[PDB]
Design an enzyme around this catalytic site. Sequence first.
Site, PDB file in Angstrom:
ATOM      1  N   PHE A 137     -24.557   6.997  53.791  1.00  0.00           N
ATOM      2  CA  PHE A 137     -25.306   6.575  54.985  1.00  0.00           C
ATOM      3  C   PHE A 137     -26.732   7.184  55.111  1.00  0.00           C
ATOM      4  O   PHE A 137     -27.539   6.703  55.920  1.00  0.00           O
ATOM      5  CB  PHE A 137     -24.496   6.913  56.245  1.00  0.00           C
ATOM      6  CG  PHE A 137     -24.043   8.356  56.346  1.00  0.00           C
ATOM      7  CD1 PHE A 137     -24.892   9.338  56.852  1.00  0.00           C
ATOM      8  CD2 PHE A 137     -22.760   8.729  55.953  1.00  0.00           C
ATOM      9  CE1 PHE A 137     -24.455  10.655  56.990  1.00  0.00           C
ATOM     10  CE2 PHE A 137     -22.337  10.053  56.062  1.00  0.00           C
ATOM     11  CZ  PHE A 137     -23.174  10.999  56.614  1.00  0.00           C
ATOM     12  N   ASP A 153     -17.364  -0.870  58.895  1.00  0.00           N
ATOM     13  CA  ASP A 153     -16.962   0.464  58.437  1.00  0.00           C
ATOM     14  C   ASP A 153     -16.249   1.252  59.547  1.00  0.00           C
ATOM     15  O   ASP A 153     -16.504   2.441  59.759  1.00  0.00           O
ATOM     16  CB  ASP A 153     -18.133   1.229  57.786  1.00  0.00           C
ATOM     17  CG  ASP A 153     -17.722   2.431  56.932  1.00  0.00           C
ATOM     18  OD1 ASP A 153     -16.528   2.489  56.493  1.00  0.00           O
ATOM     19  OD2 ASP A 153     -18.576   3.309  56.709  1.00  0.00           O
TER      20      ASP A 153
HETATM   21  N1  LIG Z   1     -25.416  10.091  67.134  1.00  0.00           N
HETATM   22  C1  LIG Z   1     -24.717  11.103  66.601  1.00  0.00           C
HETATM   23  N2  LIG Z   1     -24.443  12.159  67.403  1.00  0.00           N
HETATM   24  C2  LIG Z   1     -23.690  13.149  66.907  1.00  0.00           C
HETATM   25  C3  LIG Z   1     -23.201  13.115  65.619  1.00  0.00           C
HETATM   26  N3  LIG Z   1     -23.473  12.098  64.788  1.00  0.00           N
HETATM   27  C4  LIG Z   1     -24.229  11.083  65.258  1.00  0.00           C
HETATM   28  C5  LIG Z   1     -24.499   9.976  64.279  1.00  0.00           C
HETATM   29  O1  LIG Z   1     -25.189   9.007  64.584  1.00  0.00           O
HETATM   30  N4  LIG Z   1     -23.892  10.150  63.079  1.00  0.00           N
HETATM   31  C6  LIG Z   1     -23.937   9.349  61.912  1.00  0.00           C
HETATM   32  C7  LIG Z   1     -24.732   8.209  61.790  1.00  0.00           C
HETATM   33  N5  LIG Z   1     -24.723   7.401  60.727  1.00  0.00           N
HETATM   34  C8  LIG Z   1     -23.894   7.713  59.731  1.00  0.00           C
HETATM   35  C9  LIG Z   1     -23.061   8.812  59.736  1.00  0.00           C
HETATM   36  C10 LIG Z   1     -23.080   9.654  60.846  1.00  0.00           C
HETATM   37  N6  LIG Z   1     -22.254  10.800  60.902  1.00  0.00           N
HETATM   38  C11 LIG Z   1     -22.903  12.088  60.628  1.00  0.00           C
HETATM   39  C12 LIG Z   1     -22.067  13.236  61.139  1.00  0.00           C
HETATM   40  C13 LIG Z   1     -20.636  13.142  60.612  1.00  0.00           C
HETATM   41  C14 LIG Z   1     -20.028  11.798  60.979  1.00  0.00           C
HETATM   42  N7  LIG Z   1     -18.674  11.637  60.438  1.00  0.00           N
HETATM   43  C15 LIG Z   1     -20.884  10.687  60.400  1.00  0.00           C
END
Ligand SMILES: Nc1nccnc1C(=O)Nc1cnccc1N1CCC[C@H](N)C1
Length: 273
Positions: free
Chosen positions: A17, A135
């Site tokens: 991502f 996803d």
């Molecule tokens: N808005 C947020 N606030 C807190 C934590 N994360 C996000 C996020 O957009 N995360 C995100 C966006 N796109 C892809 C993956 C993301 N994650 C990163 C942190 C771990 C989560 N499992 C995936």
Amino acid sequence: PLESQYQVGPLLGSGGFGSVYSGIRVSDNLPVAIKHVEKDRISDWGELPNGTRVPMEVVLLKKVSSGFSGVIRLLDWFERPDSFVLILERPEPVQDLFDFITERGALQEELARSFFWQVLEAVRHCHNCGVLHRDIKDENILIDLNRGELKLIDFGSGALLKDTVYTDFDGTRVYSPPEWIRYHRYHGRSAAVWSLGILLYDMVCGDIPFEHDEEIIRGQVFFRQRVSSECQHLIRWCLALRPSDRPTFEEIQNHPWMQDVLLPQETAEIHLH
Ligand SMILES: Nc1nccnc1C(=O)Nc1cnccc1N1CCC[C@H](N)C1
């Protein structure tokens, strides 16, 4: 500039991502997440009404934009010479569903019902707005620990919802349906319902039901934990081998296992305290 508008904090995660950082909007101290995505790595490109080519996630998050807390909010976005920067909403305190299940193991059905219901409300909102997530998984679900509200994140593998077949996929293989594995072909809603069945099994069992292609294709569900008959039925129905045999979102939410859901605040009080 982005560097003067936001104070950058620690990396929250990186992978397929891109790279996601914790951040603060300097003007009002608002917690944000700063998402960087390299231009060469973009799987789906969208087009803004004004004509400019942007990552599909920018298009999809604008399409869902409302007062509805179930979907992560896009606050701002920027183009850089070799990347795109996405400013997203950041709940605080927060924990993703993957870490939550890792720490607590299999969830109590009452908790799983509350969480699954909110995911369904969020997915239904996307579909109604012409957005297909592609996803849906524990890693893409954020839990607002104070309010007991869940949010869908990462629309970077998503597409505009259509009624014709999809021949492309860049989501998570272990959540992908058997028609994608066998034929590289799936329809939006029925593929989303399959991923929802994997998610619900994951919540009540503490792990996903299938690891290998052969297991996905066979579609035989084995319950490794004690799960009620109504929940096992809902799971097996979402995980029907024939896409047309899978339930609609309406059939899921009307299922007897889905009745008498807790409110998010009741969920936070009982289960997140
Ligand atoms: N808005 C947020 N606030 C807190 C934590 N994360 C996000 C996020 O957009 N995360 C995100 C966006 N796109 C892809 C993956 C993301 N994650 C990163 C942190 C771990 C989560 N499992 C995936």
